[PDB]
């Protein structure tokens, strides 16, 4: 053992014990901004990220009120297609109790008109 | 002087920062007031017109509760109220939040924080960071925070103390991937990375000191004693490893290979004869007492260093050092002495009062840097393949703002990382 | 991550919302007038991330309670504990739902929805920090599905940053009110698949056969499922409303519980079983990955696990239950994805629900859920084959295009969980 | 708020209104000048300054001498004379006299007075019409006026009550004439048509009462039970409520499939001299003698159910109730319906008049069956059509009266078609 | 529909019309000076569909007497209850018909017809709510059925909506000698098919039939037949007549008794058969006035029922008898003789009851059928027709008042084709 003194101080001595020594002579063989550009970029990424979030939820918000809306479209048609053809049919009976009241009274006149040429063939004779 | 600032993020680095500061403050006798009754303490308290005495650390919890626990606690009068940084919101476990949505909001608030701190340095060595592999704090925030310290203090050191996650004392089960990410990210900004392996440090308490499942008070006190060992030449005027480049110098001789393993003795339990030199210096090179999960049989050391702590002679240590050297094979890598840098520090070791640590005449911290180590990278790369080929979680790191890309690019840096350590350990 | 806003909607999610209510203020200390009288700190270290502390010293519950119809509310407010609500936090319409999903999502659920979002915008904003909001309701109604969608929907458009939860009863056959409950189901698991974190699948079919088999009730009644959706409710919120090393919140449980946005539903799981009125370590640990304890009527054993979630309750050594859970990953290994590591995270907390010294809650994340939306499919199918009843839904405006939207997407859903549970490393 | 306005038309109407409008006094306590010593019954009663609770109905015939009887009898002061809306002539059993020529004379009367009790309502629900099929007021003037309400209301919900003709208690051998007209011009207009059979009515009076001769206020009596059983959810603070709203969309799986069938329980004689369980009367449901419309459900298959249960009823003993019927192979449900029964529990007992014959019961329950059994009662009248028709009978009276015979022929394949959709629905 | 307006033309109208008051009169309370005596509310709550109110609490019948021959005014007058009638509504000429159809309804009767409508138009513009008309006359003679037709016609055109309902007495060799009476009853029957919406067939030859054979009448007068017709017709204006829950106009009649516009002359029976002024000494069973009241020696119309087949029956009972027991017997009735109703009409019978009988029986059944036998009756009438117009026998009686044979040839045609619908429906099938 080749022992071989370092130093002596107040609270410690050292020294450097050797058992062999080597087999081989010698030994073989970010500024700010760059970092603040990656800080900076990670955080435009954040961003990018949380922004499609938010779009893709404003997205949906569009659609509950087109939902909303086609609701009250059916709501609408229906009322208008329950008014005409409620009108269509209201007037088709009209028309038509009006047709049979006109028929039975045409009937009834050429009855009249009859009694007048029996009336007439009787003053005939 | 040479001043060291302590840096605690996330609520691993702040409940061993608690640890820490308690442990010195009984090492050099400051109360919990900051008044006291060697100038070396100094590298590490600052002192105030009152005779307070103020630890150079700044704590950085995103999550109130961590911080209030210091705000409240025994020694807050320690602490002046701009140390203790907190928010609203944590990391949520996940890096990306960590890193990119809440770091790039507070990161100028702590860099003025540790500008106050660095203001009152003569000469600022730079930082002792401490923090989870595993949290997103941890992870997220600190690497953020070393690519920063590394603009603002060009050539200052920045030493990490690392908590591995382990399963047996986890949170989360996306820990692996918020490691490989702070990993790559902080690898060019960190000299020298001390990793604490959860699991290896909650064996040593079960297996040691009668505890059936330690808690982090049990964890955090047994690291104290780990980082003390590796600072105690700091605060005291030591003769080894003595400011915080020379830990590279020791340690670190490729600049990525700079995670070292520690190994401490003795630790024994308060509730139940002083051991030798030659014994505390044997169990140094029993696994079983490593802070990292892995074989040294498995690789070559690059470097050893022997930090002796109380009642040591150099005569025992060589003694020591001798008996092993002719029963063990040590196997150093060609290009460097097959050897050891041996300190002692006469300043005797502490044990906070009431805690489970007896209190022991001498103790010995091993610093090595072995290419065992990389074995601990492998068993976090396996986890992170296992996850990142379904593409698991990874929507949450990819809603803050991270790239997929990202998790690759990190992948293969620690790809990289494995093959160095097998090209040096030929 | 503190305050949650608790929102209740249409019948069912009123009578399980004042279930819980009643439930959790036992445990926290609360009696109906809003006046603590428990014994321990620990009920109110986190008792705001449930209640607002009012004025006078007493705790009103962070409760909207929204139906189309008042009959229910007037119920809620005569119950127990039907004081303790604020009285301007009642939203209530007059002319209800019909049992008809359209008209809860649409008509009757818009003309009340915005009355709803000015009380959870006043709830909010005396939040120092919003953690989420958590939803009850059913799914085969018109009120709670319908509208409670409509709901999650806008809230996600306000507050899209914060979590969305929801506890969704799910309807059977076997408890039925309604004809119509396979479409009200199927249209609002669209939404919910697209817009929330976590859903907690509440299956009437697995309740009322816990409560025949199980507990031997020969005729269930609602107050003995309910029974068991509060004893789940108390459960699966233990953490986020009992300080814990964990520091439990929303946001952290989504982020470990869901691998896959889509798939967000979970299975929760309760032991022990009890009735109304009338226990080891290794058998909760074992009784909790039982499908004779499973909320929703799906069996584990035909999934696997991505991720589970379990907490425990009582004095009980944490040792022997990180023993037991880790026995039963080992044995049952072949029911949990070997592509997640470590998928299974255990909490202790040491405060027992009342009338218990030992309870264990679960929640599953298993791709065996796709079972309860193919039952919901095929009752869909068997009914829009022959398009009944579908008459009053297009004549709220909704196209037949929404009805196979919502189920390919509830299919798509099934394959999806398929998919993951054949997949290997 | 939620309210009903009820209609009640032609001399069938107007007496049944006259049993449930009674019925309805006496449940709540109202007295016939309308003063009273749970608010729901507002749905159906309106009030006045004087604390007054006036009926939210109007009661319509073209010929007076019957609503002149409500003018001067017990109830004369319950309602508003302008309620009480008479012409001078009937219809003379002809439906083209109820739709055109006579009932043209005063059915905008009739929407001006609906029109003013609409006006008083802050959430109308719908309206409840009441008529024969028979009458030439009960099917041509319903048919005038319900679709006018349509015209008015739009898609308003509008429910029947209609009285199936019987010859055992019988008016005019044109009664097969009128009720395939009434029903074909009507089926797009109504929401949902509760049937009631006098035959059937008659034969319970008979069976269970022990009334030799029935009369039409013994028939009347039991018809207001049924429809008490039906409005009571709308009227009372309810456990279990079922609103219009709710009667519809479970009981009609298409538009044109809108005619559910009723089934009352217990009809117990009040001379008799054991309450019935929750059980015994849930099963009288499903047997035939206790129908309200003569077919043979066991012969058809179920679409849906509704049970009311009224009086002292616990939802344990409901529950276990239909679990029994559950596993009953003569109840057969169509396979598109995985779930067809929907329950509601009012807790008021049933009330009865007094000197009466029906006895008081702690419970009782109405059933609501949609089942295309009821198909049986369409082609019993088809027939009785087909047999006239074939030779024109009686056709002139409808022609003199301005219909065209093509009106008769497009009613009738209206109910072939109606017939053939009952089968479609029940195929698998 | 409350009030009637009652009209009778002719010596037999005004003869049956007579009887017909006295009867109802005498029903409802109401003795010759027109006041009412009755001691039941029932007798007036109703009373007005036959009488006007008068001053002084006095009852008018809502009757118009016309003839062209004035001795019957007299007769009227002199008879019980001339009295009671409205003097104005006499209007009466100064020579008859002479038995001459054309006589009544194309020259005589012309001129005096627009005399008639002044009192009709008054009692028709009084009335509240006006159901329509009911004539009494013969067919055989030249007032009652030439007038008699010719008044209809005239009616029908100003009150086209409302019911026009005759009592229409059929001639017979066995009653009286004139020999043109198939003439005058065929032209009269003509314009009944044409003009009117109910006929009630009185037919002379039942009527003295029912007389001789029954009650053994060797001789049997006028006033042994019009006790026959007076029976019959309080029996059918009964329900007209009293409060029931069936509340009975003459449209409800009509709307369902005549499934065909033409067919519609009713044959009416009764039960039980009785002289005039005769005590009855037992009454009669509600299985015996359900019996004979079907059976052909009952009917006032010379058909055998049992020949045909009934298109509609509207029956009604008069007495205290159980309504069971007539529920009993007339469903009975119908299942044992089910071949003698048309199968395509369902429930075709129609039964009512009246608490009040009649006076001198305590019990009586009134039926009025519409049966294809009638056919009958005009078979027998056309017979007699040919059998004289093949010898144009008396053709100069009517071409002497300006008619022409084609009229004549036309009405006979027109009734042969009535037969032949009677006989369409007798022999039609459901299947
Ligand atoms: N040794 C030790 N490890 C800890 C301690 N606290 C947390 N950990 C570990 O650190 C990891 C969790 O990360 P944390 O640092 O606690 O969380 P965080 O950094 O605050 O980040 P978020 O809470 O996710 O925002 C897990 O592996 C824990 O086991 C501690 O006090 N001592
Ligand atoms: N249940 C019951 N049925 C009745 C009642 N009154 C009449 N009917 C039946 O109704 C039918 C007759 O029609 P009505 O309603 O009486 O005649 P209307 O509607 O007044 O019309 P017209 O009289 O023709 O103008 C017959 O089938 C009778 O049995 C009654 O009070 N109760
Ligand atoms: N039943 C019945 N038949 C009568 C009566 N009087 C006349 N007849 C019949 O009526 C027919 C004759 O018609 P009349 O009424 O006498 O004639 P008229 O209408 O007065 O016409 P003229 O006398 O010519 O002006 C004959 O068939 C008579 O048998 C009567 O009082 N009762
Ligand atoms: C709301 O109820 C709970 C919430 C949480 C967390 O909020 C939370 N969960 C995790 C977690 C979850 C699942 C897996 C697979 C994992 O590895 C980690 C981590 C940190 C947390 F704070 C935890 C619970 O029990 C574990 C709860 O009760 C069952
Ligand atoms: C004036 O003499 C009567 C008139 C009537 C009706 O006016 C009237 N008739 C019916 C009726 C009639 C026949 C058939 C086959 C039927 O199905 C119904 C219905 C309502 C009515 F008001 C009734 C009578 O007795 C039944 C009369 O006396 C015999
Ligand atoms: N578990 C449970 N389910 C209920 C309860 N009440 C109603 N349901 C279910 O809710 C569905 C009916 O919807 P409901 O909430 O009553 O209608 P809504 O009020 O319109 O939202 C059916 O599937 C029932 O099974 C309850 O108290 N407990
Ligand atoms: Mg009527």
């Known amino acids: 053992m080749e022992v071989i003194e370092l130093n002596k101080a107040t609270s410690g001595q050292s020294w450097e014990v050797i058992l062999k020594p080597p087999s081989f002579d010698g030994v073989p063989e970010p500024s700010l901004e760059e970092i603040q550009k990656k800080l900076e970029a990670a955080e435009e990424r954040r961003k990018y990220q949380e922004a499609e979030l938010l779009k893709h939820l404003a997205e949906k918000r569009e659609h509950e009120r087109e939902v909303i809306q086609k609701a009250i479209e059916e709501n609408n048609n229906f009322i208008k297609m329950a008014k005409e053809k409620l009108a269509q049919k209201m007037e088709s009976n009209k028309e038509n109790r009006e047709a049979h009241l006109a028929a039975m009274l045409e009937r009834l006149q050429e009855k009249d008109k009859h009694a007048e040429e029996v009336r007439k063939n009787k003053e005939l004779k | 002087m040479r001043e060291c600032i302590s840096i605690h993020v996330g609520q691993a680095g702040v409940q061993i920062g608690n640890a820490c500061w308690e442990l010195y403050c009984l090492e050099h006798g400051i109360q919990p007031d900051g008044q006291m009754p060697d100038d070396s303490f100094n590298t590490f308290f600052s002192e105030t017109g009152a005779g307070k005495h103020v630890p150079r650390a700044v704590f950085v919890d995103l999550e109130p509760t961590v911080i209030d626990e210091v705000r409240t606690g025994t020694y807050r009068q320690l602490f002046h109220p701009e140390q203790l940084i907190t928010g609203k919101e944590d990391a949520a476990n996940n890096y990306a939040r960590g890193h990119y949505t809440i770091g790039k909001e507070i990161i100028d608030l702590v860099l003025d924080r540790i500008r106050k701190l660095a203001d009152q340095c003569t000469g600022l060595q730079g930082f002792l960071v401490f923090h989870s592999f595993g949290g997103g704090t941890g992870s997220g925030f600190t690497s953020l925070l070393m690519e920063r310290l590394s603009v603002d203090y060009g050539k200052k050191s920045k030493l990490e103390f690392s908590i591995y996650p382990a399963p047996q004392v986890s949170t989360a089960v996306v820990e692996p991937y918020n490691s490989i990410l702070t990993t790559h990210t902080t690898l060019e900004h960190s000299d020298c990375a001390f990793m604490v392996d959860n699991e290896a440090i909650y064996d040593i308490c079960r297996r040691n000191l009668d505890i059936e499942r330690p808690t982090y008070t049990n964890l955090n006190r047994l690291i104290s004693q780990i980082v003390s060992s590796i600072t105690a030449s700091l605060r005291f005027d030591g003769a080894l490893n003595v400011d915080l480049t020379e830990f590279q110098t020791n340690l670190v001789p490729y600049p990525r290979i700079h995670f070292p393993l520690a190994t401490y003795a003795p630790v024994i339990s308060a509730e139940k004869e002083q051991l030798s030199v030659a014994e505390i210096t044997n169990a140094c090179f029993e696994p079983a007492n490593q802070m990292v999960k892995c074989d040294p049989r498995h690789g070559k050391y690059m470097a050893c260093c022997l930090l002796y702590r109380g009642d040591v002679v150099p005569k025992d240590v060589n003694a020591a050092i001798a008996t092993i050297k002719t029963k063990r094979s040590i196997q150093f890598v060609d290009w460097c002495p097959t050897g050891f840098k041996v300190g002692i520090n006469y300043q005797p070791p502490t044990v906070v009062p009431g805690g489970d640590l007896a209190k022991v005449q001498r103790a010995v911290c091993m610093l090595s840097n072995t290419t065992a180590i990389a074995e601990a990278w492998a068993r976090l790369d396996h986890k992170f393949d296992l996850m990142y080929a379904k593409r698991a979680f990874v929507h949450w790191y990819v809603g803050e703002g991270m790239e997929e890309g990202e998790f690759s690019e990190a992948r293969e840096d620690m790809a990289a990382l494995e093959k160095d350590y097998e090209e040096v350990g030929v | ?425």
């Open chain 3, 1 to 425: 991550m503190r305050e949650i806003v608790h929102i209740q909607a249409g019948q069912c999610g009123n009578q399980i919302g004042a279930k819980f209510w009643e439930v959790i203020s036992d445990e926290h200390g609360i009696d109906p007038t809003g006046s603590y009288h428990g014994d321990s700190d620990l009920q109110l270290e986190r008792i705001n991330v449930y209640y607002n502390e009012a004025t006078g010293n007493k705790y009103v519950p962070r409760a909207i309670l929204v139906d189309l119809e008042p009959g229910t509310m007037d119920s809620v407010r005569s119950g127990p504990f039907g004081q303790i609500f604020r009285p301007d936090n009642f939203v209530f319409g007059q002319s209800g739902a019909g049992n008809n999903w359209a008209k809860g999502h649409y008509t009757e659920g818009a003309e009340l929805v915005d009355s709803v979002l000015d009380v959870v915008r006043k709830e909010s904003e005396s939040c120092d920090c919003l953690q989420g909001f958590q939803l009850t309701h059913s799914l085969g109604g018109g009120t709670g599905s319908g509208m409670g969608t409509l709901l999650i929907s806008k809230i996600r458009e306000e507050y899209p940053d914060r979590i969305m939860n929801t506890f969704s009863v799910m309807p059977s056959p076997k408890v039925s009110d309604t004809v119509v409950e396979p479409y009200n189901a199927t249209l609002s698991v669209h939404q919910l698949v697209e817009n929330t974190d976590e859903t907690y699948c509440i299956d009437n079919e697995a309740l009322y056969d816990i409560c025949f088999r199980t507990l031997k009730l020969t005729t269930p009644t609602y107050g003995d499922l309910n029974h068991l959706v509060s004893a789940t409710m108390s459960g699966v919120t233990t953490c986020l409303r009992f300080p814990g090393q964990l520091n439990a919140d929303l946001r952290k449980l989504a982020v470990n519980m869901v691998p896959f946005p889509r798939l967000h539903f979970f299975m929760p799981g309760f032991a022990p079983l009890t009735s109304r009125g009338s226990l080891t370590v290794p058998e909760l640990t074992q009784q909790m990955f039982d499908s004779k304890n499973m909320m929703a009527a799906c069996d584990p054993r035909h999934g696997r696990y991505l991720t589970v979630a379990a907490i425990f309750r009582g004095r009980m050594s944490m040792k022997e239950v990180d023993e037991q859970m880790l026995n039963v990953q080992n044995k049952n290994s072949s029911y949990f994805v070997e592509w997640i590591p470590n998928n299974v995270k255990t909490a202790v907390c040491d405060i027992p629900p009342r009338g218990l010294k030992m309870s264990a809650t679960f929640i599953g994340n298993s791709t065996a859920i796709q079972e309860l939306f193919k039952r919901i499919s095929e009752q869909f199918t068997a009914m829009f084959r022959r398009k009944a009843f579908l008459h009053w839904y297009t004549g709220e405006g909704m196209d037949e295009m929404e009805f196979t939207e919502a189920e390919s997407n509830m299919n798509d859903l099934v394959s999806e969980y398929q998919q993951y549970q054949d997949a290997t490393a």
